[PDB]
Amino acid sequence: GWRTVVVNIHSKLSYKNNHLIFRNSYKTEMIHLSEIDILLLETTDIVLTTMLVKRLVDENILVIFCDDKRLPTAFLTPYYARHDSSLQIARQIAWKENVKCEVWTAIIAQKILNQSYYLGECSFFEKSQSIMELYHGLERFDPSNREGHSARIYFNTLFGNDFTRESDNDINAALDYGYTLLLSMFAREVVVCGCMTQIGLKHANQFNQFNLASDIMEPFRPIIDRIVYQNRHNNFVKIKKELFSIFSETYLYNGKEMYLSNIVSDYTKKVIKALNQLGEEIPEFRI
Amino acid sequence: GWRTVVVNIHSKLSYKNNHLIFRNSYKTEMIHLSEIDILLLETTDIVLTTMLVKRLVDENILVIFCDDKRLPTAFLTPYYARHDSSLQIARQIAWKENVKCEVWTAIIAQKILNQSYYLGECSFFEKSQSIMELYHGLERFDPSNREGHSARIYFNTLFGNDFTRESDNDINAALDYGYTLLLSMFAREVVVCGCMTQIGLKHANQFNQFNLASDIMEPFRPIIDRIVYQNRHNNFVKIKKELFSIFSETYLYNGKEMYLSNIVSDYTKKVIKALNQLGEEIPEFRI
Amino acid sequence: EERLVFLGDNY
Amino acid sequence: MKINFSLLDEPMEVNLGTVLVIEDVSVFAQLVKEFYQYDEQSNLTIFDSKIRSIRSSELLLITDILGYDINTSQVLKLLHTDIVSQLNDKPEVRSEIDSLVSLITDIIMAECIENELDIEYDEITLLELIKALGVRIETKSCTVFEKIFEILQIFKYLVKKRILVFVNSLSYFSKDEIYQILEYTKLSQADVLFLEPRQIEGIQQFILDKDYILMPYNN
Amino acid sequence: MKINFSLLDEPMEVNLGTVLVIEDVSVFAQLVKEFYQYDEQSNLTIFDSKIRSIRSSELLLITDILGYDINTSQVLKLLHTDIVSQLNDKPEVRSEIDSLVSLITDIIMAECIENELDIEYDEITLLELIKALGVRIETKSCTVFEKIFEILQIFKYLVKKRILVFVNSLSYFSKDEIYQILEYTKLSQADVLFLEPRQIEGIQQFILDKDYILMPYN
Amino acid sequence: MKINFSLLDEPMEVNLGTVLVIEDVSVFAQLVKEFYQYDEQSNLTIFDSKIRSIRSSELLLITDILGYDINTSQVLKLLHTDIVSQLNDKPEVRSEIDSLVSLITDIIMAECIENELDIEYDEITLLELIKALGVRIETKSCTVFEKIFEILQIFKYLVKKRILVFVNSLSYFSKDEIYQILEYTKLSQADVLFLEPRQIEGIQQFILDKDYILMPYNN
Amino acid sequence: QVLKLLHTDIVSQLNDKPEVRSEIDSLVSLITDIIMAECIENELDIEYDEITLLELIKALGVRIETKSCTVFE
Ligand SMILES: [Ca+2]
Ligand SMILES: [Ca+2]
Ligand SMILES: [Ca+2]
Ligand SMILES: [Ca+2]
């Protein structure tokens, strides 16, 4: 199949006459089985039938379950006629260090470039110029640590010299909240791609289980710190309300203005295909 | 959990207050989640909730989905059972072919030794002696295929010369059924350990998700062949019930008499620890 | 205290 | 006014008219049984916003529409009181009535004075005039739709009945008539719960699948 | 027995169990109105094998199965009269009853004479003994499937009722329960007619189309 | 739950939360006066679907939010009962509690046997454990918004109060907080009527112009 | 007064043993943690103080036996 069916709403799923029956409170939709490719369930209120699951085993469609946090938890494993994604994981095991370092360096370059550009939009040209200099100075293997050096400049510029990531405040809890939402979306996209998220792009630290998605989500991180800078005076609840609007807000992809979900989807697909094909093209995202 | 719940009846399953909720028109029953070990759905008329699925993933309970024929179709695999999995992947990539072939060779030696013990308990001295000779003749890389020869002589002597593993008879059907259940429990244990299930310890070339769990479930195969040999005259339904009695029956581990699930869990733990520690001790299971 | 719980036909 | 039974995940709220369709005949018959034996069985529980469980005396259950007796002593009494209030709201009409009653009283009093026996009386009132007229609701010639409409009209007059429930009553009425019943229920504010085995097309309803899944359905 | 109304071309016969489906909601509701108004309206008619019109008193119309009380003044009157007849058919048993009632009346009479207050009594009768015992048909019904069976029993017991009619009563029972009801009706020989808005699959029924044409089914 | 006064042409219905804005200070002050003296005055009439007029004891009127006492004997008693029910819904937790209570009872019983006097006792129950713990609502550190939210939470616990009415209470809360109050009221099903002199932007409300014209207003 | 002196006497007896009163404090801590958790589960804010041994005795209703068959007893 082609279409990827994802359920974000309370609903029931049934199987009748080779037709998937999706029912939600607003309307009922019937989708042919040959059209569906991957099935993902975002929320915990979704009701499904083991008959439909049995049909999805013959159809080979990948079934993805998610928790209340929307982080993917388990997936359906058939005993026979396995899906192609399980065959795709072996290439992820075969990912070369040169390709991983190229993609990682490109990601760090995109994030640092977005930080410098957002400081330019905030009209700090000295700090924006410094972060741009570190961007042009970034190198492989990261001997200079210009990302960690760009961090302090970015946060100090945004929230002031007194602010830091290590201190406990509604601003840092807000940053971790936005990074949690982005980590959920990008992690969901990596799970859609089927690659194991425990294998990271950054070789040095394997501690986190999300390392792949956490490395992919970095070029899109400064979009959060903008809203956190504007709303930084508001209480953590208000900052959560403002960060919740990012899903509804539209942003500019290089090709066209698109939703964040589609942007992250295309970016992740280009990343995975580029890693399996050893660096055909690197997706670039700019604020 | 110590409990294996099998649902062959049409009903609705929900999650409330850390209790599995079984709702049907005739009766309703609540079973706590901490007691339940394995959840088996034997029919296609069963309905469940993705919240219950999420709580089963957090509870680390194996969920098996069968077909209309009641044969198992697909089982749920959690992405992250434990944080130690992401750290274990690096070790599995760092494993050595000498350790893999050594541990696999010892495991095959344990399986052939258990077959010789089964034929000895069945009072076949020529066949138990021949299988014992193949056990003493087993070598690395398996050039002589004494494991396959031990299997062919095993089934041919038990069920007769005219019998074969490629037959469609209910004997081979029940053998594949028990191998699928034991393969499901062993696969779930490998998910608990966190290492990749698709990477096998015997052959690099064969790519299967169940290869590793198969290599670990090799020595426990003669346990199924005993009940299949006793009930071979009974109908496939009664054979299936007697195969379900294996979970209730207890077997004697070298340390003490323990349940099958505990022997599989501790055995897999010692296998993983032996692989990471490069063969400190090899767990041996005897009938 | 039962190891195998059957909800359905008891076979 | 929320109702709950073991098959539901959460107690469902019944506001104005509510159409509940049970696709399973076993759960449907069992639930109707629980509605008739409701005081005896603890499975079906109906509670208000106070979470207080209502008594079966507060519950009003209706299955046979034309067999139900709409004319009761309390309903006719409160109806006569309502008519007396309607005649009291108009000052002119009440004055006219008082004049006519005064004339009749003068006649009868003259006839009492003509008699040899000493006779005393009190008054002829409006409530006594209505009771003498025998004002009551006519269900004899009424169609089923007019009957359920009159039931919805007198449910306001019933003081003790907390909630009105119909069982398989929507099979008689056409789609348009059902629309009239619901739109009138929204105006009357009464709480009415219909129970149907089969779903009705075109109206908002709660559907219970054979899988025991409850879903809101627009059509 | 046959029923006839202006919509049918010819009157259809109702023998043993019969399922009648009306595919028009206006003709269905109007038909039920003609059933409850049968005394008032002359449109709907019923002709027995004798081809004689029957009064509404001989027609038993039951819509709500659970809301229909088995115990009534007339039913208990005919039941008590029936038991009195059975005890009057045996002279010896009724004589023993008269002897025991004589003994009890002598005891209670003696205790009344023992009292300081004057006491007048009449007698004790078998009917007062039955009504004092509270003889009645069993009121225990677990499900509508059993309640309708009790309705069929009391209907077969009542001689005056020539036909039993149910309105939308088949929606409660499962297909198998419908089969058991039809088989019990054929075993009891009673005349039962069902009125349903929609057709039921798997059973023999008479379908009335919106075109007003009547066709047999199964 | 409809309220009616002489200025309105027809009685207006109050369902869930309802924001009533009176643009005239004279009609507003007069109506608040009628709300406090409501038992004495016949001008303001509040009746339910039964048309029965509710008593001032059934009416709950609140103006000062932080001066109102949320902790009452009935509210704390029914709250303790609710907590006991919550602990009874979980079979494991209740068994654990019963074990601990049994241990404590064994200790105290041993100490009673050691005494020279003959001592008898009965039991230590869960309700007695909660009353000994002194479970109560904390309004001391609560903000006004949390206070009105707790009032909306305990209005379910109040049995006798038919309808909750606030006077000029929406001036403290921000637009978002008002949205939270209304959206929670829809879930709690309680009947709340706010009275404000000035209209609130962004919420559905009934506006009474200086011309004494009542109009529904979306914003 | 009699129940006051009796409860004070039992409190003194339990205070004479440090270990027993420590176990009592542990169990009361556990019960307070459970009830506290259930209070946090509720949507309504809840304030509590503590549970004391005297409140445990008065909650148990410790009293001299009220059973007397005859005036001689
Ligand atoms: Ca008079
Ligand atoms: Ca008259
Ligand atoms: Ca205290
Ligand atoms: Ca006590």
Author numbering:
A (entry chain R), B (entry chain S): 3 to 289
C (entry chain T): 100 to 110
D (entry chain F), F (entry chain B): 1 to 219
E (entry chain E): 1 to 218
G (entry chain C): 74 to 146
Which of the paper's sentences describe this entry?
The majority of the particles were of a complex with a stoichiometry of Cas18-Cas24-Csn28, and a 3.2-Å resolution density map was obtained from a homogeneous set of 306,470 of these particles after applying D2 symmetry. The monomer complex forms an open, extended structure flanked on two sides by a Csn2 tetramer. The Cas1-Cas2 proteins assemble as essentially two dimers of Cas14-Cas22, as seen in previous structures (Nuñez et al., 2014), albeit with a different conformation (see below), that bridge the Csn2 tetramers. A pair of these Cas14-Cas22 complexes bridges the two Csn2 tetramers in the Cas1-Cas2-Csn2 complex via interactions between the Cas1 dimers and the head domains of each Csn2 tetramer. A channel runs through the complex that includes the central cavity within the Csn2 tetramers, and density for a DNA duplex is observed running along this channel. As suggested by atomic force microscopy (AFM) analysis of S. agalactiae Csn2 (Arslan et al., 2013), dsDNA threads through the central hole of successive Csn2 tetramers. This channel is 25–30 Å in diameter and ∼90 Å in length that spans ∼25 bp of DNA, although an additional couple of base pairs are observed protruding from each end of the channel. There appears to be only a limited number of protein contacts with the bound DNA, involving the conserved basic residues R55, K77, K131, and K160 of the Csn2 subunits. All the contacts appear to be electrostatic with the phosphate backbone of the DNA rather than sequence-specific DNA interactions. The Cas2 dimers are 12 Å away from the DNA at the closest point, so Cas2 may play a gatekeeping role in this state of the complex, controlling or simply blocking access to the otherwise protected DNA duplex. In addition to being separated from Cas2, the DNA in the center of the complex is 90° rotated relative to the Cas1 active sites located on the outer edges of the complex.
CRISPR-Cas is a set of microbial adaptive immune systems characterized by the insertion of short viral- or plasmid-derived DNA fragments called spacers into the CRISPR regions in the microbe’s chromosome. However, the type II-A CRISPR-Cas systems of Streptococcus thermophilus and Streptococcus pyogenes encode four Cas proteins: Cas9; Cas1; Cas2; and Csn2, all of which are essential for adaptation in vivo (Heler et al., 2015, Wei et al., 2015). We show that the Cas9, Cas1, Cas2, and Csn2 proteins of a Streptococcus thermophilus type II-A CRISPR-Cas system form a complex and provide cryoelectron microscopy (cryo-EM) structures of three different assemblies. The structures we present here shed light on the initial stages of spacer capture and reveal an unprecedented higher order assembly of Cas1-Cas2-Csn2 proteins that appears to play a role in this process.
